[PDB]
Amino acid sequence: LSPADKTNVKAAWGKVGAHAGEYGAEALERMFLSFPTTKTYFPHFDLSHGSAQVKGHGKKVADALTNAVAHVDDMPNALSALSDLHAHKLRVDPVNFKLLSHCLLVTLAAHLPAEFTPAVHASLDKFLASVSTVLTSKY
Amino acid sequence: LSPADKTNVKAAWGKVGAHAGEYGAEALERMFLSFPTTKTYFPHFDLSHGSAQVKGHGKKVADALTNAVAHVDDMPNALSALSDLHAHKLRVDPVNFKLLSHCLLVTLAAHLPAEFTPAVHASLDKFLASVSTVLTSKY
Amino acid sequence: HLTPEEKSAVTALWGKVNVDEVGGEALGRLLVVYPWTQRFFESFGDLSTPDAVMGNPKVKAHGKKVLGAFSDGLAHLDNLKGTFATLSELHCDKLHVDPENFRLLGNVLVCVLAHHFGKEFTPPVQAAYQKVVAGVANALAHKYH
Amino acid sequence: HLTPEEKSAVTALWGKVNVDEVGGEALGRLLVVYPWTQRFFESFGDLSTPDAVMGNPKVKAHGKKVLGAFSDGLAHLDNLKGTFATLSELHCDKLHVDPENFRLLGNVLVCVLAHHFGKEFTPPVQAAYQKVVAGVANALAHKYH
Numbered sequence: 278l279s280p281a282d283k284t285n286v287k288a289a290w291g292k293v294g295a296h297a298g299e300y301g302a303e304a305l306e307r308m309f310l311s312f313p314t315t316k317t318y319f320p321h322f323d324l325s326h327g328s329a330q331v332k333g334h335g336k337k338v339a340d341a342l343t344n345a346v347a348h349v350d351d352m353p354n355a356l357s358a359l360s361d362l363h364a365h366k367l368r369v370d371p372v373n374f375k376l377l378s379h380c381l382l383v384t385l386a387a388h389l390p391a392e393f394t395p396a397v398h399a400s401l402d403k404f405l406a407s408v409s410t411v412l413t414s415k416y
Numbered sequence: 417l418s419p420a421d422k423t424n425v426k427a428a429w430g431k432v433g434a435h436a437g438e439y440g441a442e443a444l445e446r447m448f449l450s451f452p453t454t455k456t457y458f459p460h461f462d463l464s465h466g467s468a469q470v471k472g473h474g475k476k477v478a479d480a481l482t483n484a485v486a487h488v489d490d491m492p493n494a495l496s497a498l499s500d501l502h503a504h505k506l507r508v509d510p511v512n513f514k515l516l517s518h519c520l521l522v523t524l525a526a527h528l529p530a531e532f533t534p535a536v537h538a539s540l541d542k543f544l545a546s547v548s549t550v551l552t553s554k555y
Numbered sequence: 556h557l558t559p560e561e562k563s564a565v566t567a568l569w570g571k572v573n574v575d576e577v578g579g580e581a582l583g584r585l586l587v588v589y590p591w592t593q594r595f596f597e598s599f600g601d602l603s604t605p606d607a608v609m610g611n612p613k614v615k616a617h618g619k620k621v622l623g624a625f626s627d628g629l630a631h632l633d634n635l636k637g638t639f640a641t642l643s644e645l646h647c648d649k650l651h652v653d654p655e656n657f658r659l660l661g662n663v664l665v666c667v668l669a670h671h672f673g674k675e676f677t678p679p680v681q682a683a684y685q686k687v688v689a690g691v692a693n694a695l696a697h698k699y700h
Numbered sequence: 701h702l703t704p705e706e707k708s709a710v711t712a713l714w715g716k717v718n719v720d721e722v723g724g725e726a727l728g729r730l731l732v733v734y735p736w737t738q739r740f741f742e743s744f745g746d747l748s749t750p751d752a753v754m755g756n757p758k759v760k761a762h763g764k765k766v767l768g769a770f771s772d773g774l775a776h777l778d779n780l781k782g783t784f785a786t787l788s789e790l791h792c793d794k795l796h797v798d799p800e801n802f803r804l805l806g807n808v809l810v811c812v813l814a815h816h817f818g819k820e821f822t823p824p825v826q827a828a829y830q831k832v833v834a835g836v837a838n839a840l841a842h843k844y845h
């Protein structure tokens with residue numbers, strides 16, 4: 278993550294603003310539809326369209342991403358509890374993080390045309406990969 | 417990584433000793449034989465068995481790995497020039513680093529049976545992945 | 556394997572795709588986001604900056620070709636393996652392109668479609684297009700199997 | 701595809717493989733080195749430490765089964781796709797195992813063979829065994845293609 282990547286990511290996620298929870302819920306819905314194997318991690322969830330459980334989980338994921346943006350230089354320390362969850366208790370396969378990152382990028386592209394330039398796309402991809410490897414670093 | 421990973425990697429690579437260049441050359445030979453597509457990065461190289469060019473390149477890679485072990489907590493700064501090389505000039509596909517890491521693990525397993533315990537294997541895998549992602553960081 | 560409704564949605568969205576810019580945009584974004592792929596395109600001239608990549612007429616001309624190949628695959632969704640036999644030969648035996656790059660380019664194309672179509676690129680449409688791009692990548696990577 | 705020299709070398713090395721411990725060692729090392737794979741084996745008991753993993757009778761028995769399946773695939777090198785049809789169905793449509801784990805387990809098995817045979821595991825023999833494990837993983841991941 279170059280400083281240019283950090284500069285690009287902060288502004289792009291700043292223009293996300295109060296739509297973060299909706300974007301996270303939409304990314305979760307996109308991941309569940311495109312990759313149904315990811316649904317096995319949520320057996321207790323109601324995963325239909327418009328689900329309030331999916332809405333709340335999307336808000337949580339979006340808030341975690343906002344915290345990661347605010348703590349980009351200290352992400353491993355800022356995401357220690359989430360890494361503990363996802364690696365020890367959940368032990369999610371790391372390919373699922375790539376799938377969710379792709380769905381987040383698709384949601385951002387479909388909601389922020391002007392912001393989703395190629396350079397911002399590259400920076401967001403690198404930031405999401407860094408978040409994913411932090412969340413899987415406990416393995 | 418973890419403190420336990422760092423200790424295991426340090427002990428295992430210390431047990432390599434003066435066979436580092438031979439092990440690097442053998443890992444390069446194994447990579448060229450098992451994955452011939454990696455040979456396209458060395459078109460000016462004599463890549464036959466027993467090649468002195470392969471011997472020298474293996475010595476260089478082994479010395480780089482020794483430096484990375486000596487600087488395990490400052491690997492991104494210690495490997496800045498190598499990452500610059502591999503990412504800007506060479507543009508190596510990242511999959512190739514996984515292939516070379518696997519061949520290094522195979523060489524270590526075939527030469528150090530007592531040292532290659534499952535925990536040491538996991539630590540070496542993590543260390544080689546960290547080295548690979550440092551060397552592909554500039555992308 | 557796409558259901559008839561997925562096929563109808565995919566062919567309805569593809570009919571409104573600008574065939575002169577979408578492929579070039581996808582190829583340029585692939586080069587920018589995964590710049591090790593630039594190793595396969597040194598004969599395309601300047602690729603130092605994202606602006607130079609997206610302004611490259613060779614990248615635009617090649618992207619047009621790749622989008623045409625994707626359209627050909629879309630017209631033959633049940634014979635993707637036979638549709639991409641010669642392209643698979645070219646990409647594996649001649650160019651030595653790793654098959655993970657095919658998946659990367661397919662996801663970049665999905666992102667480009669989302670960027671261009673906005674809210675009408677619904678999650679079901681995206682799921683159908685993910686099926687399509689996965690099939691195309693699998694057909695192109697067959698010579699490695 | 702393996703040349704006759706590669707087939708002879710692979711068969712000669714596999715004839716000396718101890719079928720009671722090699723599969724268990726490979727499965728245990730897969731669990732230790734890629735601990736997310738422990739999610740598929742939560743009914744095997746204690747997997748909290750590497751020693752507990754390598755000392756698990758359930759892991760040993762399942763590794764015996766997996767090594768038997770590998771031997772079955774090795775006895776039919778030209779019909780790997782039909783040899784692994786039911787196992788592919790089980791692993792894909794019933795267990796939902798991501799196909800990258802197949803390649804991971806194959807590489808772990810290659811490492812275990814190198815560990816056991818030392819200098820006997822020459823680079824040509826390793827190249828032949830990499831071909832074999834790649835074929836096995838491809839055959840097992842057919843249901844996803």
Ligand code: HEM
Pocket residue numbers: 315318319337338339341342359362363367369373374377408409412
């Ligand atoms: C950027 C990627 C991700 C972020 C930021 C993220 C964030 C979070 C957060 C904030 C929570 C709630 C923690 C709490 O309430 O204490 C959570 C839980 C969870 N996550 Fe993720 N996550 C990510 C990726 C994934 C992926 C890819 C999967 C599976 C495919 C996954 C599966 C789960 C599950 C199953 C839970 C538990 C939910 C529940 O039990 O109610 N996560 N994650």
Ligand code: HEM
Pocket residue numbers: 454457458476477480481498501502506508512513516517547548551
């Ligand atoms: C384990 C990770 C690796 C390490 C530690 C490593 C280390 C090195 C070193 C020390 C050099 C010599 C630089 C110098 O002369 O100062 C080098 C050069 C090079 N490496 Fe790597 N390397 C790694 C992985 C790879 C991979 C995976 C490839 C591609 C298959 C690759 C391709 C090259 C090439 C093409 C050169 C230039 C050779 C020449 O012109 O002399 N490296 N690497």
Ligand code: HEM
Pocket residue numbers: 592595596620621624625642646650652656657658660661691692695
């Ligand atoms: C994933 C779907 C892809 C499709 C449908 C596709 C399609 C094509 C087509 C139609 C051509 C021109 C063939 C001709 O003119 O005879 C071509 C050539 C080429 N492709 Fe792709 N491509 C794909 C992926 C990739 C990727 C990911 C890379 C590199 C990372 C790549 C690298 C190249 C190169 C360098 C050429 C030039 C070959 C030459 O000039 O002889 N392709 N591809």
Ligand code: HEM
Pocket residue numbers: 737740741765766769770787790791795797801802803805806836837840
């Ligand atoms: C890569 C080559 C592999 C081979 C040849 C193989 C072989 C087998 C065999 C022979 C069985 C027993 C089937 C039966 O008794 O009917 C089995 C079951 C199973 N496999 Fe694998 N396996 C492979 C990879 C994997 C991987 C990588 C995982 C997980 C990460 C996995 C997870 C399982 C599980 C959980 C079962 C038990 C499920 C059941 O018996 O219903 N396998 N496999």
